[PDB]
Chains A and B, each alone.
Chain A
Amino acid sequence: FSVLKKLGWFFKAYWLRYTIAIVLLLAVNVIEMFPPKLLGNAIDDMKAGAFTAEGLLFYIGIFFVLTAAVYIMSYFWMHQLFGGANLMEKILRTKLMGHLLTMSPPFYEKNRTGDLMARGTNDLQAVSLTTGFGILTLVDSTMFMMTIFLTMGFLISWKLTFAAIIPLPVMAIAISLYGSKIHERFTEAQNAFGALNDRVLESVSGVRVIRAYVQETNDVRRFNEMTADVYQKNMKVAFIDSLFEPTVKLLVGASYLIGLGYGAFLVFRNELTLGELVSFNVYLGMMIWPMFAIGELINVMQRGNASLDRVNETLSYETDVTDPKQPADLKEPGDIVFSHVSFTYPSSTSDNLQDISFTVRKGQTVGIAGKTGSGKTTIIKQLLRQYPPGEGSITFSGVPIQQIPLDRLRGWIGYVPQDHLLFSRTVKENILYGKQDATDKEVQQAIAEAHFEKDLHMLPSGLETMVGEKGVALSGGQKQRISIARALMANPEILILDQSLSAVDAKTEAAIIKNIRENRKGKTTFILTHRLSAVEHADLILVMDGGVIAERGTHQELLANNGWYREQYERQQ
């Protein structure tokens, strides 16, 4: 019941649907009490001498009217409620996705992809279950149950009613108990099945090892047989599952038998008729489902409260540190100052501090060299403003980085990361990912500038060919070239390449770098390759080691002083 307090925005937004549904639902829960009592009245009239065909026609017509009303109203409340449930699922998928889109790497570094994708599947389904079936069981457990009870009391008998209803709460609490124990034992057997799946995956992936060392029919067969004998301990679940139906049958049959016997004793005492007794056995059949519904509502609302808390821990309990509160800037002429900037990710308590002091101007190609894990990508990640801003300042031609409009800023940067990730689309759509406008001749010029087009028209079935999700005709260098073409099609004021060239040898990549620097014509470009060939043509070069600028200057100064530059230039060739 607590979760319904949390979703007050959903019910307040859709008060009309749920109000109509609950109105029709209470109306039809009232109308279902009339057919059995009318049947009982018909029996009493038949036993009486005053029965006539007019009475037959009246009862038949009233049954048809009530039947059609119950069907129609049933359709409409089902449509309204469960449409509300599916609609809540739609709304929460929309909210979760809109949250994920407006959220930076930090949130994914904390929360793994598996947990977020689990929130989108199980938790939304649980929440939608509460807005639908949960409301329904709340209605059918309280209002339908009490309506059945009060009708059985007033319109039939109170002694019969209180006698016959004594086993039903025992059924309710027994169903809750067996449901709990089934959940425990099913969790245990599901853990065993997961162990079986893990062992079979280990055997399949390590099938070469299981064949190499002769354990084919010796050990893995024994492991799968023993773990299948452990998965055969779902009989512990069956021992509890097979008490679910017979307990119900026993208690319900006892209730029917109480109703029959006490009704047959009360008819002797002239406190009941036959038809009231028959109607009682009908209402007893109506009353069974609520006693299940109590336990199912308990499970449903608890799981939905858990799921909604889990959703709001991401949705409401997370906010991006990114707020261009007062943009008053315009496209800046590449005079980008990093006179001091320093930061870390959360991976240390300000211990492995990246600590940089640099400046660049439009056309200043800034090659960045160094060893693995040495801060090269980190500085451009700071330039990309993905993480919250470091100490010091980055400034674009006078304005700090924080005050720049975020959309415009991120649109200036054409960034090729180290992981050339594709979206499982066509190569043409992957290139137009950068410039999402309508296609024109610029895409052909752009992919021609990447130099992969000579291979693209022939080898990977032309442009219109699916790539990603294992694609077709894969290659790391081809993905790198497609990423570069995407970046070029963006047409950035500031190009950034992080190790894209490393896939293909320097012979073609150096010419590609030269053609890029020719085509850009003084636009800012950052190059970060482990190799130094592309870096050699950079008008500005820096070398980092441990997140610190070892040296900085032209290629000649590095070749003279920095031994690492000449040594790595010679080692590659």
Chain B
Amino acid sequence: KIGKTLWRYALLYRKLLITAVLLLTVAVGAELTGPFIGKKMIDDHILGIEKTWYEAAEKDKNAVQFHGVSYVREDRLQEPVSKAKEAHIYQVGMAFYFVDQAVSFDGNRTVSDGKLTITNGDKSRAYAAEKLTKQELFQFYQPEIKGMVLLIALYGGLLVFSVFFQYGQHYLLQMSANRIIQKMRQDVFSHIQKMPIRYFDNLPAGKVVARITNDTEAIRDLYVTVLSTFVTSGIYMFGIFTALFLLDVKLAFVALAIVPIIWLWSVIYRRYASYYNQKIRSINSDINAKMNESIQGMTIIQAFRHQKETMREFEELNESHFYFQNRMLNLNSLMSHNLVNVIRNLAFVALIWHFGGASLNAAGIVSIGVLYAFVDYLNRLFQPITGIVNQFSKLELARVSAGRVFELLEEKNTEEAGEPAKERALGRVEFRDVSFAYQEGEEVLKHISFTAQKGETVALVGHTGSGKSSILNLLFRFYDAQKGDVLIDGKSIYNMSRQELRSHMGIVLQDPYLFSGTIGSNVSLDDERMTEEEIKNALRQVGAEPLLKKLPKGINEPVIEKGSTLSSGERQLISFARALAFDPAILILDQATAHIDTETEAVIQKALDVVKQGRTTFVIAHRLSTIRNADQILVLDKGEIVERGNHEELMALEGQYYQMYELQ
């Protein structure tokens, strides 16, 4: 399946992924420690005054002076005196009131007539208290300052370690993704090179290139999604809930309600947004298609005045686009960020309710630090929810692209083999009962059989032009082992390796594709062995076909366009040059139908007079000069054989030569 193969490629480079996850985990732990440090700083130091105090002799440094009386805190005690003037510093509104006497029990504190009255339910009890001045409160807050430049230092110290590891994990997840995609692109291209011509002849080049390049970018986005959005946030959320359960289990089990919420919202968003975004993408493609059809066919519209109806169709598509886009806007409004803000405010509600209930009875004294920690953690929790949800909605297109690639990778009937080039063939080609049905139903070749001689085999002609011709170029090597047999020098074509067949053949297409790079690179194709020999053959090329342009005075001219950058004739010159460079042992030239028959073709004719010096130069003799200058001629009757003879065809069937003279 799709996910199985993605896991297969990801288990490769497992060291980088495991390193990334570990660095991530450390960074997450470090980053999430900070709010727990804030909890410590709140509940211990800033709320330590709320904790009980004792009176002891001023021997320890922890003890703090209060109007000449030294009071030491319970948590900070060394057990010198128990129940020795127990004291409470309760808070009445914005005024911390000192209660020297041992407070019996907490409650709703109120200050009346310079006396503190504490009420708990029905019962109430009063004590004497004195309002503290700013200085006194600060002095009592002094036995914490010393311990607050460790908590702060820890927060600072665990925030500059997390940062480096966070950089590390993001880089490693990236590196792992791009390396996996590198391996995937290399594997796909190697499998392309093994695959047959039939796959290319079915669909255009665009689908192939999309599978190699564009779909692999989609898979890169998938891997970065899964790793940086799902896995990262998953580990983050796990650590967050770990901390929340270490803080308050009862409230954390409320906070876990967000996970079913995310499940529900991401499921609904998928279910609807897949439909809406599919329709938007389809309609946008339809709109761009309408614009391209219009611009290409504007003159025809103007001629017949179809512009009003065309604009009506365009506005129909555009208004449907606007409808679906507005519906998706409604969904995203109700269910992307506004919902996050809702969840955030409701979380604050749950906090206020729970901690208010704590502020009732006597469980709300040390808990406000937990409130701060929850408030800090939940913002970290609700941030990536939108990213998770949107990427979950977007995963389906990436799974589609990945499946389209793994269809290509999992294809069978590959042409894998070696390339023996041990000896040069003589070129005694022959055929016996050769019948090849490319369309399985339709027979394209009907028992063709002819014996080419040892060189000077120039016998090829289409069925009066544009009939059953070019497929014979495909007959030898691209399609094989259907029926009949074909031999070269007394040995079978099918038994030999296909690269061994191609090791000595050389073909000029009807549309020679000029490769990128230099003209020397376009000819030699950057062959490693043929570096200096490319220049040695370039001497022969300039001697035979001189550089009339000669823009850089060498072979450094970069090829700019795919074909006919300089002239249509130069394309053929480069093609014949590439043919003569590799091997003149066997070669099949183009049909030259597309060419205009300018004077430059005469130079190509001279190149033919060079190129026919080689061994067994097949030529689809469409041109009159190619017909007359042929050593032998073989016109085919729809894959069958009319006859053989340069003059015998002229004698018997005068209409063929006359028709080719009329056409050419």
Which A residues are within 8 Å of any B CB, using their own CB?
A: 32, 35-36, 39, 42-44, 46-53, 55-56, 59-60, 63-64, 66-67, 70-71, 74-75, 78-79, 82-83, 86-87, 89-90, 93-94, 97-98, 100-105, 108, 113, 116-117, 120-121, 193, 196-202, 204-225, 228-229, 231-232, 234-235, 238-239, 241-243, 245-247, 249-250, 253-254, 256-257, 260-261, 264-265, 267-270, 273-274, 277-278, 281-282, 285, 384, 386, 407, 410-411, 413-415, 417, 421, 423-424, 433-434, 436, 469, 486, 490, 571-573
Minimal Cβ-Cβ distance residue in A for B661: A571
Judge whether B304 and A486 touch: CB under 8 Å.
yes
Q: Chain A residues with Cβ under 8 A from B582's Cβ? A: 213
A219 to B189, CA, bound (A): 12
Q: B625 → chain A, closest Cβ, in Å?
A: 17
Judged by a CB distance under 8 angstroms, whether B479 is at the interface is: no
Q: Chain B residues with Cβ under 8 A from A78's Cβ? A: 329, 332-333, 338
**Provided the pairs A90-B319, A282-B375 are in contact, do residues A208 and B197 lie with their beta carbons within 8 angstroms?**
yes
Judge whether A66 and B345 touch: CB under 8 Å.
yes
Judge whether B478 and A56 touch: CB under 8 Å.
no
Contact bitstring B137-170, A, C-beta under 8 A = 1, else 0: 1100110110010001001100110111011001
Judge whether B190 and A120 touch: CB under 8 Å.
no
Judge whether B166 and A572 touch: CB under 8 Å.
no
Contact of B152 among A196, A261, A273, A433 (CB under 8 A): A261
Judge whether B34 and A433 touch: CB under 8 Å.
no
Q: B493 → chain A, closest Cβ, in Å?
A: 15
A277 to B375, CA, bound (A): 12
Judge whether B322 and A573 touch: CB under 8 Å.
no
Q: Chain B residues with Cβ under 8 A from A277's Cβ? A: 372
Question: What are 25 A-B residue pairs whose CB atoms fall within 8 Å in the complex?
Answer: A49-B93, A67-B345, A75-B334, A82-B329, A89-B322, A93-B287, A100-B291, A120-B291, A197-B214, A199-B516, A202-B513, A207-B197, A208-B507, A211-B502, A214-B419, A214-B421, A216-B193, A238-B175, A246-B166, A264-B148, A269-B134, A270-B138, A273-B94, A278-B375, A436-B304
Q: Chain B residues with Cβ under 8 A from A225's Cβ? A: 186
Inter-chain pairs besides A78-B329, A103-B298, A256-B376, 12 sampled, C-beta below 8 Å? A86-B325, A94-B315, A197-B214, A200-B213, A211-B197, A250-B160, A257-B152, A257-B156, A261-B152, A264-B148, A433-B300, A434-B304
Contact bitstring B613-629, A, C-beta under 8 A = 1, else 0: 00000000000000000
**Provided the pairs A63-B345, A70-B338, A87-B322 are in contact, do residues A260 and B38 lie with their beta carbons within 8 angstroms?**
yes
Judge whether A220 and B46 touch: CB under 8 Å.
no
Judged by a CB distance under 8 angstroms, whether B45 is at the interface is: yes
Minimal Cβ-Cβ distance residue in A for B210: A197
Q: A27 → chain B, closest Cβ, in Å?
A: 14
Judge whether A204 and B174 touch: CB under 8 Å.
no
Q: Chain B residues with Cβ under 8 A from A197's Cβ? A: 209, 213-214
Q: Chain A residues with Cβ under 8 A from B351's Cβ? A: 39
A441 to B72, CA, bound (A): 110
Judge whether A56 and B353 touch: CB under 8 Å.
yes
Judged by a CB distance under 8 angstroms, whether B92 is at the interface is: yes
A211 to B197, CA, bound (A): 10
Judged by a CB distance under 8 angstroms, whether B314 is at the interface is: yes
A37 to B193, CA, bound (A): 67
Contact of A196 among B93, B213, B306, B337 (CB under 8 A): B213
A60 to B354, CA, bound (A): 11
A282 to B372, CA, bound (A): 9
Contact bitstring B168-199, A, C-beta under 8 A = 1, else 0: 00110011001100100110011011000100
A82 to B516, CA, bound (A): 46
Please provide the chain B residues from 487 to 506 with a CB less than 8 Å away from any CB of chain A in the complex.
499, 502-503, 505-506
Minimal Cβ-Cβ distance residue in A for B144: A268
**Provided the pairs A224-B186, A245-B170 are in contact, do residues A235 and B178 lie with their beta carbons within 8 angstroms?**
yes
Chain A to chain B: the 9 pairs with minimum beta-carbon distance, closest first: A49-B109, A242-B170, A268-B141, A238-B174, A46-B359, A206-B513, A67-B345, A78-B333, A74-B338
Contact of B46 among A70, A113, A238, A267 (CB under 8 A): A267
Judge whether A246 and B167 touch: CB under 8 Å.
yes
Judged by a CB distance under 8 angstroms, whether B341 is at the interface is: yes
Judge whether B162 and A249 touch: CB under 8 Å.
yes
Q: Chain B residues with Cβ under 8 A from A253's Cβ? A: 31, 34, 155, 159
**Provided the pairs A46-B359, A198-B516 are in contact, do residues A204 and B208 lie with their beta carbons within 8 angstroms?**
yes
Judge whether A221 and B189 touch: CB under 8 Å.
yes
Judge whether B297 and A423 touch: CB under 8 Å.
yes
Judged by a CB distance under 8 angstroms, whether B309 is at the interface is: yes
| Residue from A200, A222, A229 with most neighbouring chain B CB atoms (10 Å) | A200
Q: Chain B residues with Cβ under 8 A from A246's Cβ? A: 163-164, 166-167, 170
Judge whether B322 and A105 touch: CB under 8 Å.
no
Interface footprint category on B: 35 or more
**Provided the pairs A67-B345, A213-B525, A241-B170 are in contact, do residues A56 and B356 lie with their beta carbons within 8 angstroms?**
yes
A12 to B192, CA, bound (A): 57
Judge whether A47 and B368 touch: CB under 8 Å.
yes
**Provided the pairs A71-B342, A86-B325, A98-B311 are in contact, do residues A221 and B368 lie with their beta carbons within 8 angstroms?**
no
Q: Chain B residues with Cβ under 8 A from A86's Cβ? A: 322, 325-326, 329
Judged by a CB distance under 8 angstroms, whether B562 is at the interface is: yes
**Provided the pairs A78-B329, A197-B209, A253-B159 are in contact, do residues A410 and B322 lie with their beta carbons within 8 angstroms?**
no
Judge whether B353 and A60 touch: CB under 8 Å.
yes
Judge whether A63 and B349 touch: CB under 8 Å.
yes
Minimal Cβ-Cβ distance residue in A for B160: A250
A205 to B511, CA, bound (A): 10
Q: Chain B residues with Cβ under 8 A from A55's Cβ? A: 356
Judged by a CB distance under 8 angstroms, whether B653 is at the interface is: no
Minimal Cβ-Cβ distance residue in A for B190: A221
Judged by a CB distance under 8 angstroms, whether B200 is at the interface is: yes
Contact of B506 among A67, A206, A213 (CB under 8 A): A213
Q: Chain B residues with Cβ under 8 A from A199's Cβ? A: 516
Judge whether B349 and A64 touch: CB under 8 Å.
yes
Q: Chain A residues with Cβ under 8 A from B360's Cβ? A: 51, 53
Q: Chain A residues with Cβ under 8 A from B301's Cβ? A: 101
Judge whether A49 and B371 touch: CB under 8 Å.
no
Q: Chain A residues with Cβ under 8 A from B368's Cβ? A: 43, 46-47, 274, 278
Judge whether B509 and A208 touch: CB under 8 Å.
yes
Q: Chain A residues with Cβ under 8 A from B289's Cβ? A: 424, 469
Judge whether A50 and B509 touch: CB under 8 Å.
no
A231 to B360, CA, bound (A): 63
Q: B282 → chain A, closest Cβ, in Å?
A: 15
A506 to B516, CA, bound (A): 44
Judge whether B306 and A231 touch: CB under 8 Å.
no
Q: B64 → chain A, closest Cβ, in Å?
A: 13
Judge whether A75 and B562 touch: CB under 8 Å.
no
Q: B293 → chain A, closest Cβ, in Å?
A: 6
Q: B92 → chain A, closest Cβ, in Å?
A: 5
Judged by a CB distance under 8 angstroms, whether B18 is at the interface is: no
Q: Chain A residues with Cβ under 8 A from B465's Cβ? A: none
Judge whether B300 and A417 touch: CB under 8 Å.
yes
Please provide the chain B residues from 313 to 364 with a CB less than 8 Å away from any CB of chain A in the complex.
314-315, 318-319, 321-322, 325-326, 329-330, 332-334, 337-339, 341-342, 345-346, 348-349, 351-353, 355-360, 364
Q: B607 → chain A, closest Cβ, in Å?
A: 18
Q: A214 → chain B, closest Cβ, in Å?
A: 5
**Provided the pairs A63-B348, A278-B375 are in contact, do residues A264 and B189 lie with their beta carbons within 8 angstroms?**
no
Q: Chain A residues with Cβ under 8 A from B322's Cβ? A: 86-87, 89-90
Q: B309 → chain A, closest Cβ, in Å?
A: 6
Please provide the chain B residues from 222 to 258 with a CB less than 8 Å away from any CB of chain A in the complex.
none
Q: Chain A residues with Cβ under 8 A from B419's Cβ? A: 214, 216-218
Judge whether A235 and B174 touch: CB under 8 Å.
yes
Minimal Cβ-Cβ distance residue in A for B335: A75
Q: Chain A residues with Cβ under 8 A from B342's Cβ? A: 67, 70-71
Judged by a CB distance under 8 angstroms, whether B295 is at the interface is: yes
A17 to B288, CA, bound (A): 29
Q: Chain A residues with Cβ under 8 A from B337's Cβ? A: 74
